[PDB]
Every structure is written in C-alpha cells, then in structure tokens.
Design an enzyme around this catalytic site. Structure first.
Site, PDB file in Angstrom:
ATOM      1  CB  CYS A 238      -0.929   0.018   1.217  1.00 21.66           C
ATOM      2  SG  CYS A 238      -2.220  -1.255   1.122  1.00 21.66           S
TER       3      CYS A 238
ATOM      4  CD  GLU B   7       3.027  -1.402   3.095  1.00 17.01           C
ATOM      5  OE1 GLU B   7       3.322  -2.604   2.911  1.00 17.01           O
ATOM      6  OE2 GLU B   7       2.000  -0.867   2.583  1.00 17.01           O
TER       7      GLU B   7
END
Lengths: 793, 793
Positions: free
Chosen positions: A433, A435
């Site tokens: 997502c 990171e």
C-alpha cells in the site's frame, strides 16, 4: 496545453483485459498437492533444502497455461484470476470453507467438489506442520488473549506467506538465472570452511542452485508449450507470435534479456514465480521504469506502438494473480487484491530526476487497461518536472485511484533515520500500500500486523478491562483522572503493555518462518543473501524491519481532545457521566436523554482535519505514543520495528471491536482510514484538511502513512482544475506529508454501482493504498467509501 | 600388612547380583511406543517443548517395576538387563534385525513377536524424522564416502543419543527436582524481555519445568508401587523395607535427601531417568564418593553394614542398564556395555586429598559385587595416601579390570590447556572409558567418532587411493619419496584432508541434535544451561568440546619407523619392493618368498614399547600429527575439538579396514588398543613398556588416552607383589602417562572360558576402559585380549 488526453489500447489488449474482468475466481489444488508431496518426500532435509525440493517439484510439474492472445506468458493458475493453496502456512480454514467460500460476502471463490476432495487428501498431511501452528506455540497466553479480544492481529503472515518485497529485477534482466547460479557457485568456492558455520551456508547455497535450476526448467516448459501451440496455430500472424514467445522463454530468464519483449517476459516470470513459491502478497515491481528502460532504449527494432502494447500486457498479467484468505481475513484485504506496487519517477542514486520515456508509457498503460492492478504510484520530489506531475494528475482524474503519490522529501530522510544510506534511500520504491524500502536490499515485513489504537483507548478508559476480562494493567479508573496528564500517563502504560505483546506475536511468527519456511528462490534476489549465505527469513537482507499498522488514529485524537475540552476545560459533563454514557453506548438502545445530549456535545467538539492546531496536536500526540513505543523493539533478524499508519480494508472490520468513544461515535462503528480525518468531519476543504494531516509526525511512521482524499470530478475539470489539483499535492508534500491519493467520483456513480452491480463490473476505485472493483467490496466497505468526505475546489 | 583382603556381601546382594548374571537381555517396546505417540501428538511445538512432552509421557506412563530384594528401585525395562528402543535417533536397523538380533555375534537380544509387531507399527511414523537422517543430509558426499571406506565413523551419536556426561548429582541431592523448578522459575522472572531472544529461552524454561514436574511424578509412581507391594508381602521384614522404599521415593528426588538411603535413591533415579530420556551412554556417576559422602556422615542412624549394602545395591542397579545397537556398531561397544564411569579419590578444589570413608566403601562394593559396572576408577596425584593406592591395588588383583587409574598431574594441566579453570579441573571426573571433564559444567562429546590413523597411513602410501578409489589428495606415490621428510609431508596432507571431513561429520551430527533433539531434563543438571536459558545441545554448558578417537597408533608408529630403518637407513629393501609386498599382502596368498623375506625383516625392526627412543619417538610424532590436526577445529556449540586415543572394543573391527602395513602386519589383522604397544611386541617387561608409552604427548590428547597392561597373577602376589605394582603405577604417572589399567589373569583361565563358557558366566575382565563378561565377547575379541602381552616383574 496541459490537457493531453490518453490513447487507446489495441483490440487484443481490450480482449485480454476483459478476460480478467469476466473471470470467475476458482480455488485450484495442483500447487498445494505438489508442495505437500514434496514435503512428504523430503522429511530428512534441512528446511532450506526441503523448500528447494518444494519449488523444484512445483516448477517441474505445475500445469503450464498460455491464455488466448497473450504476448507475455506465465500463469499461476489454470483458470484466469484464480488462486492456489499454500498449505505450508495454514490450511484448516480452507477445508472449513469448502462449501461456503463460493458464497461469502468478501472475495468469494468457487471450490469444485473434485478440488475440495484433492485438498482434503493433501491437508491430511499438515496438522501441526504449518508455520502458523509453530508461531502460535511460541506466543504467550496473554498475547493470544489480547488478539482474541481485538487489540491487534498478526494474521497476515500467520496464515500466509510474507512477500512484501521488491526483488532485484534488474540483476536477473542482466545476468539471468544462470548468472544467479554462477554467483552462488563462486560463493561456494570462496566459503571459509575452517569452522562449523559453513555447513548450513553450504546447504543454503545448494538449495538456491537447485531452485534456480528448476526455475530455468519452468521457463523452458513455457517455451515448449508456446511451440506446441504454434504448431497447431492456423493464423500465421498468431503463429509467428507464438514462435517468438517460445524464443523469448528459451532465452529468459535463464540468460539476460536481449530485447524489450524478452525483458517484459523476464519481469513477468519473476513476478509470477515468486507468488508460486509463497502466497506472500505485496510482491512489488517497484521502480519498473528504472530497471526496464535500458532494455527499451537498446531495442532499436521495436515500434512505439508495440512497446506500449507489451507494457499493457504486463499490466493485465499483473491482474491474473489472486489469493484467497480465511473469510474474516479476506474482509481486511478485500477485492481480489495482492498489492503489487509499481512506481515511476523520482530520483536516481545521484539525486537527478529519474523520468524517462517508459515513465510515461507506464502512465499510459494504466489509462489503457484501467484495472485494479498494478498498484500504480508516482514518486514526487522538489525536482519533479511539471509535465510529470500534471500528466499524473490527468491520470488521477480518470477516477481509478491511481497513481498514489509518495513524497521523496519525507521518505528519504525517514529511511535514513532507520539506518538506510542516502544512496540506498534515494532508490526507494513502495511496497504494497504505502510502505517504502530500499529495493532488493530489505526484508521489511511491511504489513506484519494490524494494531487498534482506538481499542487501546477504550481499554485505558476502562482501567485495563475489555468485557470483563482484565486484559491490560490497572492504570486507574477514568473517574479518578485529575486531568489530561493522568490520562496520557495511563494511555502510555496501556500502549507499552499491548505493544510488547504485539512485538511478541510478530517475532513468534518471524521465528516460525525462519525455522520452517526459509525461501531459497526469493532470497537469492535480495542483497546480501548470497554474500552472507543466509535466507531472507534468517537475516540475509542488508536492512531488516518489522512494520505494524495503527488503526483509529483520528478516532483516538478527536476522542482525547473531546475529553480535554468538554470535560476538563469547559465542564459540559463529568467524568462520571462520560463513563456512564460510554458504557451505555450514548443511550443508543436505552434512549437515555442525558446520554444523548452528552453525545451531541461531544460530537460537536473541534475535530482533526480542519486546520485547528489544538485538536490537530492531540491527534499528533496520540499517534506519536504508538509510534514511539513500536520503534523501541527489534526482531530476530537483527532489525527494528517501525510503525505504519494504514487500514487496508479493515477500518470497518476493526471498528466492530471498539465500543463507544468520547468523540461520540457509537459502538462497533467504523474507524478512520490511515491518517485521514474522520469520515465527513473535515468540513473546511482539501487544503485545510491536508494542513491538518501534515501536522502529524510522518517521519517516525517510517513503515508508511496513508492519506485518502475524494474529489468531486467537476472540481478537477479543465486546465485550471489540473493546476489547482497539482498545487494541492505540492502544498501537502511541501508541508511534509508522506503520501496522498485520490478518488475522483460522483456520489451517484457509487450509489448506482450498489443498485445495479451488473452494469458496473469495471468500476475501479481506491480503497486504501490499492484500488479494487467497487462491486466486489462488501456493502459495509462500499458505504464507508461513500461516507468519506467529498472535497471541492 | 599391606593386604587386608575383602569382606563378603549379604545374601541379598548376592541374589541381586545373580539376577543380573542370569538375565537374558530383551528388546522392549513400551518406551519407543510412548515416545512415538508424544511426537505424533505434538508436531506443532518447538523441539525443546516436544522433548518435554516426550519425557512427560514416558515418565507418566512407563511401566513401574521393582525387582525382588531391591532396596534401591527404578527400572528402565520390565525385564532385568534389557533395552528400550529410542527411535528418535535411528530405527531402521532394529526392524532389519527383528529375526536376527537374538542370534547375532555380539550382544544378542531377544525380540519376541509381540514386541516386533509393536515396534513395526511405531516405526511407521519415523522415516526421515530421526536425528540420524538429518545429520546425514548435512554431510558432504566426500565425507560419507570416506566413512564408507573405513577411514572414520561417527556412528555413536549418529545412531543413538549423546550422553557422555556427569550431571550435578550434588545439586539434586541438596535441593531436589522441586529446587530445579524453583531456579527455573526465578530465571523466568528475571528474563530480559526487551528483545526477541527471550521467546526461545522461555520455551526452554517452560520445557524444563514440565519435564521436572513429570520427573517428580515418576518417583511418586515408584512410591505407589512400593506401597502396593508392601500390602501384598507376607514377610514382615520385607514388608517394612517396601514401606521404607515408599517413604524414600515420596521424598526424593522431589526434595533433597535426608538419609543416606534416600541419597542412594536420588542417585539411582537420576542415573536411570537420564537413560530413559536418551539412549546416550557413558552417563557417568563421576565423583560419587565426594557428593554422596555428606549424606553418609550426616546419617547418624545407619550402620556401616547397611550403608555398605546400599552401595552394593547401587553397583548392582548400574548393571541393570543395557543398550542395543545395530549389529556392526554392537561389535565396537561389545559386552552389554553403557560405560558408567565412577571415580573415587583425587583432590578437592583447594588441592587437598579427597579420600573419605565412602571412598573405601566404593572399593569394597566392587569387591562385593564383581560385575562389569560401574566402570570403577581411581584418581591419583602426588598426595595420594599410600593406603589408598595399596587398597586400590589389592582390588585390581581380583582380576576384574577395575579400578582403572587416572593421573591428576597430567589431566589437570591438560584440561587447563583447553581453558578449564584450575578450580574446575581439580574437580574432574572420568567419562565413559578414559575421558576427563569438569563434571556438571561440560558438554564434551567425549566419544564423538572413531578415526583410523592406520587407514590414513595405508592411504598415504597409495597416493590417496583406497581400493579402486581416489579418496584423498594425490600426495605422491610411495616409490617417489626421497626420504622420511617426503613421507611426513604427504602424511600430514592426508591427515588434514580426512580430519576436515571427520570434523564435518561430527558437526553435522551436532547440528542435527541441536535442531531436533535438545534435552530439557538432562540440560537442567549442567552449568550453565539454566542461567543461559539454553540446552546442552545448543551450547548451554560452560565448557564445550568434541572428542574423536585415534585407532592404530602403535601400528602407524612401528610401520613408519620400519620404513625409516629398513628402507632408508639400512637399505634392506627398496620402496618399489615395499609397495609390491604391501599390495601382495606379503605373499600371504602368492607364496612369494621375497615378500615373505621382506615380511620377516620388517617384523623384526625395533618396536614401540621396549624403551627404545628412536622408535618410540616415531610413535609420538605420528600420534601428534593426528592430535595437532584435530585441535584446529571447533564445533557449533562454540567449543573445541580435542583428540583422544582409545579403542573401546573396535581395534579388531577397524583392523579389518586396513591392508598390510610396513611393520609386517597382514591385511585385516587387529590394530593396537589405545596407546598400548602392539600385541606381544613389548618384550622387555612392564617398566620398559610404560616408559615407552609415557614418551607420547598425553597432554594434547586431552579427550583421554588408554593404556592396557595384563599381568600373570603370581607376579602380583604378596606384599612384594603389591609394592612392585604400586611402584609401577607411580613410575608411569611420574613420567606423565595419563591412564593405566590392568588385567590380572592366567592365559588358561581365558582359554577355559572360551572352551567352557557355561562354567565362566561370571568371569569379568577388562576390554579397554571398561570391563565385561569374557563369554559375551565375540571370539575374535576374546582372541585379541588373549593375544595381549602378559607382563611379569
């Protein structure tokens, strides 16, 4: 003008896209059965060699499937967009769900009777031999009780593989699998054999070589299938295509790629084969415009049209992957989602701008294909060219949710603060997502856990209780607080207790994977596994992290500020009444009018997201209390825990675990997504809201923060809408927010998709850090996305 | 005078003794079946907790057997002197031998059909799950090839458990199993939980506590059986005895001992229960007179006759233990032998003499019982009282082979050279045959391997070949040596090649035990396993070693000297004729008279053992070449390899692996035992021979050297016999030999036992570092003992 518009894909690309969209996802058994038989046959081997035997059997024997029209080939499953089973991590929920999985709300999969019988037989081998069963045995009883009561969960890597990595695609592009084998052979030649340490390193090296020999066979099996299909092809144009695919698969990935088409095939073989070895998702292409562009630049023969068509085909293949999870876990990762993040732009290792012609082809491919995957992303820095930002904004205006935008000027220093060199940090990509990592140098564990800060707040106000279970320390009843100092001291003690358990749970899963499932194929593609002779699971990566995610940040901040203002500063109600109102769910069921009046008072306190410093700083402080606890801890790979703040699709799910809160939200209602303001509570416009979000400490949340915005499409229209829109991004990033991403959609389009889903199968929108088909999402998730604040300029 | 003779045991002790002698050894299945179910039931646990569950199930459920007349109770097997099966280490040879084990050459065991059926079913679980199967998987192909060709073997810990340890009997005597549990509980409370390291330590701690809770139950189950038998027993005296045994087993070893009878019962529970957890042999009581004596002195009620009778009962119980091995390994450890070494005397930690009244009672017990076990020993130092040495000498004159004698003045500096503190080294005991350690501080692996130095010599002279096979490097053909320098250069290169493989094989077994079979019951009784939170198998001991044994030392030295004198110096024959004579086995088949004349010339060269420096120093150099290579290596416990030199019953077995040697020895003939001169070749008497043996470097062979002498009994008769005999020991120890031990027996007595074994079932003599029933030994081992030089003064 700034508004250039988008070209159309070829008819074949449309056909391939529609094949994904029309596909009914199945559960398949072949990989699970082959893996199981490889385990059964190899009980005597060290785990790393057993894992080599596993991928060797799967790569040698898994069905080879080339789909109609493909130019880029390699299928994990016989059926498009279907899922394998990886029983080595967990299995019993699959069998429990044999008859319900086709009908469950989130991500249904068809399980035919014969597939169920085949899985049933294979699962007989597995009781107690999974990674999950070992991980649970390492955890303390209190840690498990805390998870059972919804304080946090480590399900992701407990039930499935790890993944969450961007491998060295460029190395394989250059030297191939044969080059990997040669590097390992030289490492064996140079092994210091003067102590006992060489024995296990030698097992690792021999495991890698066996794995990569089988990986070469796998590509050759696809070459053989391409030639078989070519011989019975009747259209000579498709015949020559199949012949060229056979040639491609003969060359790559065994050897380095020599054309752009071969380079695309190298990329896809790695991307799919990693997800055959393990069910870990967030296998992230990362900086695909960087490592692929040399192969485009060097290919003098390829047309611009065909080069684009191949990138389109890669985008579509990325959507062929799917993954089933247990029925509750599926609700947290909803949308047939495996989170392959692919970013473009940013900086070179030298600090120059990294845009190249492929950068823009990647944007065009997203406009051509318009599917959930890849999780397309742009890096942004002070030197981003206007043309790239505005082209990205043009793409965002299509309403697919992509690209997500990431701020180099926060992420690079954030990584540096965790020990990443400037050179490595400049090369970062996004995993999953939101990171960030230094690609092919990191075992980051970037979605190791979900941790419910709002639940910790709930438990704090109830003196360590949840239900009538004493789950945390007795930090004091809320009625005995003399002021906010007493609260924060109590809240910090609860946080320390539950974060220590979170770390225990992650580290137990970490030990379990290291002991039972170290991966010889994946590990060779990350520095410095070959040089050290150690797998990723045992500390071979240069950088090692563990990243657990906070839920309920804005819920916690606004609740704590409501106590500060409404109880202590303005004395609208007492601690005793607040306690009574919370326990009674604000009278939701009793109708108590004082509790209702109290709710109305709390509901109208100032809220995070309106550029009000008082309340914004409480949200910042509550997030800091989590983030500062997490980073105190280390993992068994010698690495550091680091907090992230993102919800994937679980801020509804985990809101069900939290009772009524002092900001007035009723029991079991949704929590806020990531670092975004509470749904509908940022009422002063997108600039005010972004100013609030940037007041948080994004740098300490170095596993990544997630900020969602949703715009009215007409606000972004025209050249002048684009310019305002780009100005909003630069505003937020200049104020040191880490990430922002946008839905661009009318409320009635979402409402129509609910009423008439058969007419909206291709409606793709952002959930959180990834996009998905809106009609695949459960109604409660759909309603949550509809409830998000609509922004306008 | 100096000969006071020996008392006689009670009728009870004689009955208990004859029960051992008349026992037919069986294989039993209960423990193997219970262990298998515990593994099946606990697949999900970390190995240390699985092993806790294994001992819990066995301790809770193993049959409880008290034998007629016993005062000290606890049975590993239902049938006296029988063997359990430990399939966790290896199993397949047991089933291969179902129909043959009752009839095999060495150590037959009866396997009834019901037992074979039970084991057949249990063994279905084990394929690939044993420690042996994993150990083999870590070893390189060349290492396994050198073992198949008889260069060396790691069979001992490959097929069975480790053992080879003297545990903290004194601690259990003082604080009990309850006290162990309390120490671990305090270690749990004191654990640093700030990193990931505590997770696995806490598993270890919980495994230890579980194991000791079940260990307490085991003792209580014996208390309940004693009470049951007491209610059945007509004889009032035996009834009261069983009531006292019930009381003993209720108190110990859960709590510390409060009488000498309880202390003996604590001792025996530890000794037997360790060999229930694991098949590892050489579980060595060690300094029994030191840790048991405080409980004798404090017991003001017990008479000296009853205290002696309890010690006698302990001696007999030590003979109840037995162990089956595969039919080839059984020939290397022949005689129903588990090597439980018990030493008396020596020094205290402050360097004072340690003789006490129990010292002499242990000597009496050996004279009373006269069975193979314990492997009884004395320590000797400059301050040994004359009464001690002379009493031990009278005991040796009985012809049992015991006590073996160990030299403090070599062993203590030898241990110090390996990093043992002077304090710890002063407290040393002997393990197994001859292997010294600081007791309850060491994981010594004191019989990790047998390594055939004579085979390395063979291979050196055939340019790395063994048979039709290139096993070592091509160091040069024998005929190309210009002189002894060339030979030693090649020999050292061969030695380095094969010792590296030896170390690999040992360390592979070492890793396998650490990964699959760490022991929570045993580990708690060795410093510093509790303090570190680490099993013995993973390095919890303060001192860590690995000890591999040289075979063929005198054979190698005499052969190398024969080349030096007969070929290079005196030119009696060419290197070419020597090569031809070796290949033709000295014309043993061909009748070649030149090879027979060469045989006669080589056989009559000077030999080690006649106090001739020239040839003695070649033996020293050849043994050094082995010992100096071994000590360069380390094990995965952080410890050091250290050579020993001792044959147990394998110098005949391993001579079969060696072809003709330059000393005249024919192909496949026996090798010399330990550091003893070749059979029959020391012809100048025992003082000359001891003088030779003391010229070797005993200190570098710190895993222990072994020297056998055998005397005509008339030579030791009288006061003058004892004075000569004590003076011989003191001579040899002053000249820095480490160990010596004596057979004292007429040749005709051995011959009659061979011809009329049913009249000589109780004939017990020394093999090598242990004593055995002569009639149980294979003819070829009997003949080897008979061939040993007979000494006289």
């Amino acid at each position: 003008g700034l508004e250039k518009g988008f070209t159309h894909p070829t008819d074949r690309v449309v056909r391939l896209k529609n094949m994904i969209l029309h596909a009914k996802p199945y559960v398949e058994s072949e990989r699970a059965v082959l893996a199981t038989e490889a385990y059964k046959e190899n009980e005597q081997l060290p785990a790393i060699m057993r894992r080599a035997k596993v991928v060797e059997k799967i790569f040698n024997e898994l069905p080879v499937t080339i789909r109609p029209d493909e130019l880029i080939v390699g299928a994990v499953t016989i059926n498009p967009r279907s899922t394998e089973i990886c029983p080595e991590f967990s299995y019993d929920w699959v069998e429990k769900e044999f008859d319900t999985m086709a009908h469950r709300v989130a991500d249904p999969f068809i399980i035919e009777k014969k597939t169920a019988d085949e899985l049933h037989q294979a699962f007989k081998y597995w009781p107690g031999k999974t990674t999950s069963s070992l991980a649970a045995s390492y955890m303390s009883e209190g840690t498990k009780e805390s998870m059972s009561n919804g304080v946090f969960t480590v399900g992701n890597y407990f039930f499935g593989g790890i993944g969450h990595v961007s491998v060295d695609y460029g190395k394989v592009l250059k030297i191939g699998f044969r080059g990997i084998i040669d590097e390992v052979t030289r490492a064996l030649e140079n092994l210091d054999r003067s102590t006992s340490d060489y024995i296990k390193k030698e097992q690792f090296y021999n495991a890698v070589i066996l794995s990569y020999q089988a990986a070469i066979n796998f590509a050759h099996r696809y070459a053989q299938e391409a030639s078989r299909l070519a011989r019975e092809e009747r259209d000579p144009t498709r015949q020559r295509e199949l012949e060229q695919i056979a040639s491609n698969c003969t060359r790559v990935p065994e050897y380095g790629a020599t054309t752009f088409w071969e380079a695309c095939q190298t990329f896809w073989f790695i991307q799919s084969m990693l997800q055959i070895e393990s069910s870990g998702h967030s296998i992230s292409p990362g900086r695909f415009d960087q490592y692929m562009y040399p192969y485009l630049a060097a290919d003098t023969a390829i047309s611009s049209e065909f080069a684009q068509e191949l990138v389109d085909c890669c985008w579509i293949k990325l959507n062929d992957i799917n993954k089933t999870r247990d029925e509750i876990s599926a609700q947290a990762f909803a949308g047939y989602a495996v989170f392959q993040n692919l970013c473009v732009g940013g900086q070179t290792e030298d600090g120059r701008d990294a845009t190249n012609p492929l950068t823009y082809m990647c944007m065009e491919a997203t406009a051509h294909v318009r599917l959930p995957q890849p999780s397309f992303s742009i890096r942004v820095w002070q030197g981003t060219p206007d043309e790239f930002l505005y082209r990205a904004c043009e793409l965002v205006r299509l309403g697919l949710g992509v690209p997500a935008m990431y701020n180099d000027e926060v992420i690079i220093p954030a990584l540096q603060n965790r020990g990443v060199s400037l050179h490595d940090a400049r090369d970062y990509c996004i995993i999953g997502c939101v990171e960030p990592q230094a690609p092919h140098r990191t075992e980051g564990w970037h979605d190791a856990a979900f941790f419910n800060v709002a639940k910790v707040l709930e438990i704090t106000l109830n003196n360590g209780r949840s239900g009538n279970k004493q789950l945390g320390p007795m930090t004091g009843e809320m009625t005995q607080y003399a002021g906010m100092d007493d609260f924060y001291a109590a809240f910090k003690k609860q946080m320390a207790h539950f974060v220590h358990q979170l770390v225990e749970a992650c580290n137990s899963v970490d030990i379990a994977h290291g002991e039972r499932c170290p991966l010889p194929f994946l590990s060779a593609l990350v520095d410095d596994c070959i040089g050290r002779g150690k797998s990723l699971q045992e500390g071979g990566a240069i950088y090692n992290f563990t990243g657990p995610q906070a839920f309920g940040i804005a819920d916690t901040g606004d609740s704590v500020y409501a106590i500060q203002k409404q109880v202590f500063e303005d004395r609208r109600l007492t601690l005793q009444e607040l306690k009574g109102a919370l326990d009674a769910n604000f009278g939701y069921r009793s109708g108590n009018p004082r509790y209702e009046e109290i709710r109305h008072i709390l509901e109208n306190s100032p809220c995070f997201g309106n550029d009000i410093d008082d309340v914004d700083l409480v949200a910042r402080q509550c997030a800091l209390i989590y983030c500062q606890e997490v980073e105190k801890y280390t993992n068994p790979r010698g690495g550091r825990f680091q907090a992230g703040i993102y919800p994937v699709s679980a801020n509804v799910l985990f809101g069900k675990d939290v009772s009524a809160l002092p900001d007035g939200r009723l029991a079991k209602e949704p929590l806020a997504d990531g670092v975004s303001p509470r749904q509908g509570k940022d009422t002063l416009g997108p600039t005010a809201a972004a100013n609030s979000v940037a007041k948080l400490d994004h740098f300490i949340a170095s596993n990544g923060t997630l900020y969602n915005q949703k715009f009215l499409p007409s606000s972004l229209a025209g050249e002048k809408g684009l310019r305002n829109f780009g100005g909003l991004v630069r505003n937020y990033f200049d104020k040191k927010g880490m990430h922002v991403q946008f839905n661009v959609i009318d409320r009635n389009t979402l409402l129509e998709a609910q009423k008439n889903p058969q007419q909206h199968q291709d409606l793709v929108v952002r959930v959180a850090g990834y996009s998905a088909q809106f009609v695949v999402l459960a109604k409660e998730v759909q309603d949550d996305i509809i409830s998000r604040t609509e922004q306008q300029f």
